[PDB]
Motif scaffolding. Sequence first.
Motif, short mmCIF file in Angstrom:
data_model
loop_
_atom_site.label_atom_id
_atom_site.label_comp_id
_atom_site.label_asym_id
_atom_site.label_seq_id
_atom_site.Cartn_x
_atom_site.Cartn_y
_atom_site.Cartn_z
N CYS A 85 0.84 -1.19 0.00
CA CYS A 85 0.00 0.00 0.00
C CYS A 85 0.88 1.24 0.00
CB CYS A 85 -0.93 0.01 1.22
SG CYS A 85 -2.00 1.45 1.32
N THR A 86 0.58 2.18 -0.89
CA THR A 86 1.35 3.41 -0.97
C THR A 86 0.43 4.62 -0.95
OG1 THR A 86 3.02 2.23 -2.26
CG2 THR A 86 3.13 4.63 -2.25
N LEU A 115 -2.77 7.15 -0.06
CA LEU A 115 -3.22 7.71 1.22
C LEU A 115 -4.74 7.72 1.35
CD1 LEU A 115 -0.21 8.56 1.35
CD2 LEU A 115 -0.98 10.70 2.37
N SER A 156 6.69 6.64 14.52
CA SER A 156 7.89 6.94 13.76
C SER A 156 7.84 6.32 12.37
CB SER A 156 9.12 6.44 14.51
OG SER A 156 9.27 7.13 15.74
N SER A 157 7.33 5.10 12.26
CA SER A 157 7.33 4.37 11.00
C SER A 157 6.43 4.99 9.95
CB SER A 157 6.93 2.91 11.24
OG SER A 157 5.52 2.78 11.26
N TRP A 158 5.53 5.88 10.33
CA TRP A 158 4.63 6.50 9.36
C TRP A 158 5.36 7.57 8.57
CZ3 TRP A 158 -1.17 6.90 10.86
CH2 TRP A 158 -1.56 5.71 11.48
N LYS A 159 4.82 7.89 7.40
CA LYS A 159 5.41 8.92 6.56
C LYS A 159 5.15 10.30 7.16
CE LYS A 159 5.20 8.59 2.09
NZ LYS A 159 6.62 8.32 1.75
N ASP A 160 5.63 11.33 6.48
CA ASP A 160 5.44 12.71 6.89
C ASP A 160 4.62 13.37 5.79
OD1 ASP A 160 7.53 15.43 8.16
OD2 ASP A 160 5.76 15.59 6.89
N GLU A 161 3.30 13.34 5.95
CA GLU A 161 2.38 13.95 5.01
C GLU A 161 1.34 14.76 5.76
OE1 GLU A 161 4.40 13.10 1.90
OE2 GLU A 161 2.45 14.07 1.64
N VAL A 219 -1.76 14.84 5.43
CA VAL A 219 -2.95 14.05 5.74
C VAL A 219 -2.71 13.16 6.95
CG1 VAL A 219 -4.63 12.43 4.81
CG2 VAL A 219 -3.62 14.16 3.33
#
Lengths: 762, 136, 325, 424, 199
Positions: E40-41, E43, E82-87, E89
Amino acid sequence: AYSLENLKKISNSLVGDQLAKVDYFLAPKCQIFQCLLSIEQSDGVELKNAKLDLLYTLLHLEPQQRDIVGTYYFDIVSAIYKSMSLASSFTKNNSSTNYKYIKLLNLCAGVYPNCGFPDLQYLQNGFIQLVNHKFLRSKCKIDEVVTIIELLKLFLLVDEKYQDFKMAESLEHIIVKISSKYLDQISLKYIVRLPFDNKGVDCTRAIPKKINISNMYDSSLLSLALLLYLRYHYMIPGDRKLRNDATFKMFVLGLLKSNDVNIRCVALKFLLQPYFTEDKKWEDTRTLEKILPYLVKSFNYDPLPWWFDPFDMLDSLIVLYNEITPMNNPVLTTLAHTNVIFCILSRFAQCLSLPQHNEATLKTTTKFIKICASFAASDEKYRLLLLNDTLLLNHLEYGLESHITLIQDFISLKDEIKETTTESHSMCLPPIYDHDFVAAWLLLLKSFSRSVSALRTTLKRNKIAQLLLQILSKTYTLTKECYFAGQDFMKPEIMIMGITLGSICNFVVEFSNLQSFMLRNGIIDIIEKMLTDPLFNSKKAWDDNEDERRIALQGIPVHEVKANSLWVLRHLMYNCQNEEKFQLLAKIPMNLILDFINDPCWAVQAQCFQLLRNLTCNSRKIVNILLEKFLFEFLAKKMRLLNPLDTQQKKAMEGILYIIVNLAAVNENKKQLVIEQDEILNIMSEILVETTTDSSSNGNDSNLKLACLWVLNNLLTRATVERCRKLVEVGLYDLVRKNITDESLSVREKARTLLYHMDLLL
Amino acid sequence: VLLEANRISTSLLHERNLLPLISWINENKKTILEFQARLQEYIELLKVDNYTDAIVCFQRFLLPFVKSNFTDLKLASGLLIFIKYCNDKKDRIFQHFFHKSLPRITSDFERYLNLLDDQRWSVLNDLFLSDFYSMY
Amino acid sequence: FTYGKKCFTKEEWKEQVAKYSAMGELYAPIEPTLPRLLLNYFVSMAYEDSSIRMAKELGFIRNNKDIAVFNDLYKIKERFHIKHLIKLGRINEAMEEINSIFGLEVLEDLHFKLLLLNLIEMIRSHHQNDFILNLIQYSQNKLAIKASSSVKKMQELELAMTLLLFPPKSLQNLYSISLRSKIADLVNEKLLKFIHPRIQFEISNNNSKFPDLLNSDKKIITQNFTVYNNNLVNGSNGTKITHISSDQPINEKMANSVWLNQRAATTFHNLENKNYWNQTSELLFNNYYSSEFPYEPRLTQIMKLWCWCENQLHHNQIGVPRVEN
Amino acid sequence: MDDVDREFINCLFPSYLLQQPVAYDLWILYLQHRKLFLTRKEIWSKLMNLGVLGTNDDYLIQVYKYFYPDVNDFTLRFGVDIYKILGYFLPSRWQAQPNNSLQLSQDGITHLQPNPDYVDFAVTWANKSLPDNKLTIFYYEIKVLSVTSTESAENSNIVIGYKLVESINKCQKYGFDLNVFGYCGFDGLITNSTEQSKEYAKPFGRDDVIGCGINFIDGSIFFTKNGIHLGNAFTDLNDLEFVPYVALRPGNSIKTNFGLNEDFVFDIIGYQDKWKSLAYEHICRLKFLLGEDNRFIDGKLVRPDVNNINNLSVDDGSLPNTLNVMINDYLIHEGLVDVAKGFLKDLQKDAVESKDVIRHNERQIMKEERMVKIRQELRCALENVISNTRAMLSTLLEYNAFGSTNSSDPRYYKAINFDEDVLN
Amino acid sequence: TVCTNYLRPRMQFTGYQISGYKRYQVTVNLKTVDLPKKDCTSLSPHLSGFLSIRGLTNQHPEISTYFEAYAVNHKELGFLSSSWKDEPVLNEFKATDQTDLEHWINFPSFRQLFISRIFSQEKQFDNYLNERFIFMKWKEKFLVPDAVDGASYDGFYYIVHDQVTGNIQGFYYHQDAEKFQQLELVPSLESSDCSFEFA
């Protein structure tokens, strides 16, 4: 108008001077043509060359000069196509005459393409014979090579909507015999983690050094041969094909880094065709990762060949990974990680706001709008990022209003336009210059409308809905009243209608504000009008007056509109009480819905079945109406004919299965009625047996298994015990017991609780 | 009286469109109106297809004025050629709806346009008026 | 009054030269590659006798038949004849010769310059009122439509007409004779570029023993001229996104195409407005080397580079001895 | 200097460096150490038998491979420590730190990882530095191949770039200081940006390949990621000496490529050829005698107040006339008197000041013929131009010379390989 | 894209939310559901629905909000923040690592599943959809009918879901709250399938 001495002087007095050229088309001097293009199979070989040179010189006019001269120019061109006898004797004429004639033919096809050229097969035969005999044996002359180049250029332009095998063989032989001189220039050093010439690993992210072709004729020949071979080769069977070779693939990858722009473009096309054509190739992200940099770098070279278009290929790649595997787009990730998405968005914003537009800028903006719609197809990130501007919606409304105004102006002026334009262009009229622009805007709006948050906070306008309804009504009315403009003017508007219905079908869904708005303004009336048109519903008849309309609009494809109409009707009845159900049934009766059930398009069948599901979804009355309106073997035949390996067909199958689910819950009488029929039990048995080892029939899916388990659950005072015993005897206890070992938790839990209930009742 | 002559000259420049009765500027500067007036005479004569007199006046009244100003002579000489080209239902339907034009059945000189705008009359009269006022 | 950074002496400069002079031999104090340069210069400038003798000296000539084949292949005689005609003043005959020997493709911009030079030649011949009228008629008929395509061509037209009406500065320049020589050299280079591919094909296809004096095989050349621009779609910009800066609808800021009806019959693709991207990017790095720097006498550009190097050394306070003889 | 030597050179050194004016030094090195030395595969086999081509072998075995095309098969089926010895003065490996703080493979290239048994950054720099007056483009690449498994699937903790040569506690604690130009791989920030230029790129991830290039014509340092070229990062950095520089947290690890035995991913040669073409276009788009240098007095060169020293140009016709005189003199010097006579005839025929050239040439021919007659009956000023042009290009490269009255204009003289480009 | 038994598009949930000593009513109605089965990429939210509550402050008897929800699958959506992206949303779901661990540990299922130990052992996990428990986060977006009474909703929930019975547990979190506000929900029963599809 006589012997070579005169023709040579005339030609030498006609180079680069448009004034004398346009003067020669005036009445006192038109007599030269009666001798110029009346060339028999005689009169030397110098005279033919002089005449062909003179014809080529005269027909060389800039566009405003062409407008000045008028229709006599195109009459001359038509006479060149239809009354020149050199194509038939292509093999017998001298080489120089053939070269000059092909150059003249190229110019004629480039200045006036609509006029039909009736002598292609002669040229194909001549080309095949000439290349297969003279060229491949190296006993060739300069004019023959240049003639082959010209012939390839001419063949490239054809629209195309046994000799194919011979042409493909000749083209492949050309490609091999020209490229074999340059294979020894490939070089690639790499490191692989666990001698040489093993070629064990070529997933190394690097591509060989550039390959340079010194000879210009070789460059042109290789490029055009590759292009035409790409056109033909997939329709040719056999093994050990050129496309599948490894050394050739390395050769083309090396060619990517060349200097000739045509070479780079044709290499890109050859390398990218398999993704659109070959199947399962889309799981090869390494090649895309190593290719994409050059596709991006191609946007900057100024003189581009007319057969190359980076915008279209980039859009096609994005659409491919959107349509087949959403929620993962390697193109989008690769572009976003390296700043080019932002450059594209910024250039879109810049082009949207130029001080003064024209045709070219309008087309560029249309392309940018389409690619931006492609970004936001299946990712909320880009939806919100585009919507953070708070200025696109104004331009959207402006474009929609412009198209509506143009359509209104045309419909108001219908009678005068028809009266003044019925003798020359009776059924040949150009389309409105705005079709592509509004089409792109509608694609963008449809892409936006997929996020419920946006439907509830930023698209909650009334102007959008009013404009959509107006466009639908106006386009259908234009179809109704102005059928005298033929297919060329009609096809784009029907495409617009097909797109706009699909864009609407999101607004009308439940938990969206504008559903009440669309219902108030009456989408149902418009759809009811469209669904009874004999142009759409094929089970009707035309009146005595519409014959001209029918013959004018006979060969137009209309199924997107039908599918989207049924789609909207489905969305109107999703989770609604019986009042709205009976209102819509009062407007559109059951007869139309049942009439759309045997259409030859699979999508229409799928949407009809899903609408039937949502219609019978929790209704004790509409089930009775449907049962009266016919009995059951039709559903079994449908489930037997439909191929579960197809997406739309699978959707239709799920629709029918859940129709059975809803059918088996109205009353105990219906429960016994559906228990009695035996074939459907055989379909359930064939569905449930499939497991991981046996995934051939019905594809080993879980939604179908859940649907069948739901059917069984809905089937449950001594009559219930009898039905339980019958289900046990038919071979269902063993099936549900063996389902406990499946790989998905949902079916396991449903199976265990169903088995417990069955045992408890038994 | 001063005002009477000023008004007569201004009217002859504005109401009528002829340069004669400008003899004061022709024989009294002795201190860019002369060159402008001669150039206006040249352009006015060339507006009608007359050439010989235009060539004579170019050789006679604009040749000595080459040392100071040179670009305007270039523009005038270019106009001497480009004058013939610079100056002057179904089709309307097609243009407004389809942006296409039918063939007729027969079977960026912005500078030069600026040299032909009628506002030149107004600006020339304004220059004469300002010079006459500031000189009296 | 003194350089300051580094003033080489004579011995120091000789040592500096001899440091790297040894590299000339193992790429091909002698220069082993200069005879080929001499032959290239002799052929390019259409010097027939020098080219013939130099080719004979290198072993490419063995009899008179090979002389004829060489002179035909490289078109030395015809190019010399055209150059001589243009230099002498007779120009319409030069155009006739170009059309006859080579073909109409050479002229179907250089034709505009040839027509101009014809105009100046007839003006100069007249000086040894109706004459002005005839020349105005001639120019208006022949040159106006060509000149209506850009701006500088116009400037050429009114320069010519200001000269014509004249009985100064930047006009004696255009009235000088060296313009003929510049035009002739331009035509010579254009003809070389025109006929190079046939020479390549004849050397390759035929098993000929003649040498390719232009763009030796261990390189790459092309006939097109492409441009590369970075102010377009690329990843070289920051992560910042602009936004719409306008409100007027597009339809408020906006013909020429022709609509034709047809008359199995084959139809062709319509290329009307397919280069929209090129004409649209103009409202929002070129291959000079390979495409335009094989087509000059190599010795000429070596001399150019040497002069530039000497000047660049002088500007930067570095003093080196010159070359004497 | 047979073609075998050329093959050895092409196999040994990086490709994009041989096309610059630094290849002279590499040829000098190889000629000095020449003693150690279809048919392309034969030369490759000879190199492999004693050299560098083959297999670190515990868990991550590597092997090098060459591609080899089988032309005959194609036409049949479809038809009708060495660098230590050589003295290679460009960087080639990482440098092991004295304190046991980070482990790197024996090659110094194949694998670099901070020592786990030894959070503070572990930093290091290449073994050699970059001379500022020899090269025109330098470029190396890295491939990260392990992440701390905490930052993200697309976020690292690496700082890669260049360090200005002659404190390190700041590098250990923060990651960089005032003397480091790099690309921080955790926040996507250019080192020491501090100019509202924080919008350069995104942080890189797990399998990304990153190139850190320096261009000496503009005087700029730029970075590329996965093939696509991000723009210039630092500008106006001439007359400085740099060294490759890396900093890692105890979780990450990288694999380097300096271009010796592996192909790049960026296609640096194209980027270099664009600059070469720009330079070439910039350069080349009585009064004809080369007398004694007048500005010699007492032996020491003195300069005049004139702006230029060579006023020869093709507008005045001085350059062609001087070239013709020089060509005739060269022809006279080395036999070839009939060719000179033919040249004189052609010069006479073409002309309709050149008469001075004709007179001078005929006088020289008559003198040479008279001397030849004397010699028979008794019993170079043009190579200097090529030699001096090569020497002056080398001199302009050696002492850093300005573009045009500015230390920021591009120094176009750097992008000229005289022998390989102009004479061939 | 997969929907399970008890996360179907129209499935109700009822229960209570305990704050201070009181416990207010609650009601959750799912609207859209879809969970990835593979890499999954994108959002796009995994779940979205309504969170109508009643019995809150006297300024309004009941308030309804729309919420969006992301599930945890141990790849690119790990347990910590921490493992989540920086967006933009995803940035509303993020908090410090220590508080994330302290909140996760209070679930009697997160413990039964087992500082850096959890991150190290996360990569060993497989096929999150074939699990007894599913962990996820919910965040509010705006008001339902208005599209007001002194109640803030700028925090997020810590939902854990038991697949076989349908139970939903979790804690509310925000910086300026009591830091332990919990809620429990039940399936609250269904024999018909009215389904839609976005175009």
